[PDB]
Paper text:
The cryoEM map also contains a few unassigned densities that were modeled as polyalanine chains and which likely account for the N-terminal regions of TssF and TssG. The (TssF)2–(TssG)1 complex assembles as a locally pseudo-symmetrical heterotrimer with a 2:1 stoichiometry. The N-termini of the three modeled chains form a three-helix bundle interacting with a triangular core, which is formed upon trimerization of the C-terminal domains of TssF and TssG. Each TssKSN trimer attaches to one of the two extended loops protruding from the TssG C-terminal domain. Loop 1 anchors a TssK trimer near the apex of the pseudo-threefold symmetrical (TssF)2–(TssG)1 C-terminal triangle, whereas loop 2 binds another TssKSN trimer at the periphery of the triangle.
Type VI secretion systems (T6SSs) are found in a broad range of Gram-negative bacteria and transport proteins directly into recipient cells. Localization of the needle within a donor cell is mediated by a pre-assembled cytoplasmic baseplate comprising TssK, TssF, TssG, TssE, VgrG, and a PAAR-repeat protein. To address this knowledge gap, we report here the 3.7 Å resolution cryoEM structure of the EAEC TssK–TssF–TssG complex.
Residue numbers in the entry:
A (entry chain H): 45 to 84
B (entry chain H): 337 to 392, 404 to 587
C (entry chain I): 47 to 392, 406 to 587
D (entry chain G): 122 to 330, 336 to 366
The structure:
Amino acid sequence: CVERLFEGFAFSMGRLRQKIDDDLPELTESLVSMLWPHYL
Amino acid sequence: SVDAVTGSGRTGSAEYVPFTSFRHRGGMLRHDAPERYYHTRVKRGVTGMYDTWLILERETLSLRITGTNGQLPRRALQSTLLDRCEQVLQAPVSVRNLCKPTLPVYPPTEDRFHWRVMSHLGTGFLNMLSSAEVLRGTLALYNWRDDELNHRRLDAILAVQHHRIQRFEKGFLLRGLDVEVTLDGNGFAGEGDIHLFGEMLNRFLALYADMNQFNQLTLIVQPEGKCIRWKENHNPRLPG
Amino acid sequence: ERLFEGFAFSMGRLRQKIDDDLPELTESLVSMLWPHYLRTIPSLSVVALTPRLSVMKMAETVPAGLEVTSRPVGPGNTVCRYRTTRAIPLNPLAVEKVVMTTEPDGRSVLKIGFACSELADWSQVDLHRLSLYLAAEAPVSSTLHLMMTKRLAALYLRLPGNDERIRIDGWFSPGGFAEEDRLWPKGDSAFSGYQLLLEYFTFREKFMFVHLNGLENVSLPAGISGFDLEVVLSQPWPADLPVTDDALCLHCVPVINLFTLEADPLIINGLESEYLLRPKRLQDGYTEIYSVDAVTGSGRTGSAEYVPFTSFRHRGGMLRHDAPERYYHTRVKRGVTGMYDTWLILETLSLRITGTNGQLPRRALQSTLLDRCEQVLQAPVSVRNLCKPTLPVYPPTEDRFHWRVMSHLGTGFLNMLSSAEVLRGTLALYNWRDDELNHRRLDAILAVQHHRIQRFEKGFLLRGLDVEVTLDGNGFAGEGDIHLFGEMLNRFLALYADMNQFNQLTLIVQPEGKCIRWKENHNPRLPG
Amino acid sequence: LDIFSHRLITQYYRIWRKYSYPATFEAGGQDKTSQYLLGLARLGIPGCAQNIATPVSRFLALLPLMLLPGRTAEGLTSLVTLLAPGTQARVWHHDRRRIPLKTPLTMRVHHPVSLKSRPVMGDHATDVNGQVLLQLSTQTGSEVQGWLPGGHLYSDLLALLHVYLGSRLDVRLQLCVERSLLPDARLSCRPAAGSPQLGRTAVMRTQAKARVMTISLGRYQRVQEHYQRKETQENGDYRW
């Protein structure tokens, strides 16, 4: 039972981790734009 | 772009300000200053257009928005003629297109260029005149047309050097900077291009250089040894 | 219970990545500003390699990189592999004795006895700059350093026949600031104004090497065995001090635990992003990749030579046009065992990779002695460890360290460096090993003030900035540490010298109110 | 297992917030991302804020300027405009100041002065490379009072110059406004921040005789060049 719960959990953890690496470019470009307004 | 955002509710006019221009009460923390703001975010939509998202019950907002045109045909833009100029003035005025229109220019992208992000961030720690390598690299970041000709122009920069200048004016001793750049004249369409390039560079230096410093530009044409010198100062000075 | 452990374990990891807040971007930028802030510092020490003196006719140069392995250390009985960072011109002489005494004139004198080989050929012996290491506790050697180096009044060479009063033209100078060693593979950056600071706070021992210059002008009679030189200094050497024959050593050099890993053939079956690099015998659990030196393979176009991406990025030029020349790049990250994994970003490639030793028991290493030096030299040099070996020092990776580091670099940074709080805060960025001594010294900064300097030269008004720092001498090993610190701090401060203003360092020793200063730091450079 | 779902949801929202800058502004340099920007502005070392004594977050509005190696007039104009939009400003270079001499110019036999030093008479020398002039002009009494000594705009401008120019250059400040916006000089048994100063603002009442009046505001200078040299006891003396 716990093995099944683990796999479900690991899937969710995968998605959360993937999101961290997915929205990173957004903040990255935002920062650059803040410094150099013509950038985007 | 969004030029203005003003709404209306039970509190009267809702005076929102743009986020990036840091808000007075928000950043300055003083009285008689607003705490309402907005920011704009853009995403690429299915048609390649930018979808504008506004980052702010039943409050009503009046949005003043300037627009442009989207994905118009490549050929059409190069064959577009102009219509009559609105006759606001008493005299009739006809129009003439003096050149084929320049199509919209987008910032360079290959794989989003983490290298571009890094190039800009790195640039922030460098003096543009520290070397030819830096000068070429940094200037290249503005060549959004991907024009091989513009590349050859920049690639003609062989060396950058500078010296301190000791000069007099109106009986006073002033400091300045001698900026000397060696160019490969084969990268330009003769003096016409070399001069205009230099004129731009001279102007740029004026906007880059520090205060209480005059700047002159010397361009050397390596194939001949001759040079073009810019010795002028348009800044208000010596008020007393 | 197991479900609980699993859940909590993984949730922790996720939370940590979030809290770290953007190393992903920051580190990549920092590495191109600070060429050495994305690396660990390998363990190191100072080892004496002493040749048989009895029979040695000519001097020999010990090649840089000569390896001295250690005895078995820790479980698995692995060893360390240390190699010299300098070439050493071994001469046929040795230190016989060290005697501290005093003249009737009130001048303190240090008498140092030496002996020469039975067959020493003085036309071959390199008596130009004799490199002597001060092998004694800091509370005493720090004093000794200045007493010999800066306070020297006279030098005499005592020859057989009671010819003790032979005045010698020469002087002592520090070698810790030499460009030739650098202690790291960094001959391109040469940012001495910064590197010296890490060295001061970490492996300080490198600064306890003092050269005696001018022996090339000293003619001596042929002979065998003992002779003496006398160092006469302009002080009452502090009464409370130990002296010993082992205090001074000639034939020694700093060595670092770095060695070559096997250049295994790296092959790929597609452009699957980045590739994992790993050496053979990784199973020992100690070996670790330090850095990749070169990448060249063999493809359908012949030698598959690659160019370190950084050679383009360091310049910051038209990367758009430089990158097509088969660049390569590497990244590192700790694995689940805490050891670093190395990734390659780009057919067989030959990867030349330097490694080191990672995780290990600290007491086991500290108590480990060195084994025999590879027998390359004609003389069977003996191996003597002159200082308990260090353990690996890792950079801080916490809070906003990396951003503090970037802020530090700007030329304009100098403008905020006007108070003790800021000065301590910035110096702290180099204290990668937080021991008691460094904290006591760092906290000795009591006050920082700025004063303006105005002078006219050739009718022009020249501006400069006087940076005065008040120190608590109790945080220092007397004058020794104060002056070494000061000299280093000056060299550092000079980094912020500018075309439009010069800097000057002044230090105050608060326990006495003693003021000492350095000359102006001039550098006609653009205001980076 | 409710906690499993709860915790995962919580982390999701934290992750979302992580990359939304506006959300984390929190009316000051409190978030890591705000501090990151200040780091790039060369204000990332703790303890430096205490040497400014202002809402440091204000400088974020000037961030693009602080990425440049020099400090142009464009910057000073921005500072004034930001604090009190409407106020105009102009900058002159090579503002002249008189410098006292350490020694007078005299004639000697053993150690005479060479003309290579470009000597001047012994009382004062000129300096046209140490100062710039920043002239302000307003269109309302409110702004004027703010700019006058003791006012909040006067204080804020100096607070910003402290960092933006630092020790590079000194700035002379003056204000050009109609006489009708100035107070009538009056005595008081007790001084005050808003009290008129003898040599700057103390304009006498006119007997019902508006023209533009130029008044002084003050001068920006960080290092006072006072005397605490304590000659020397010892020095760096390595022969190398």
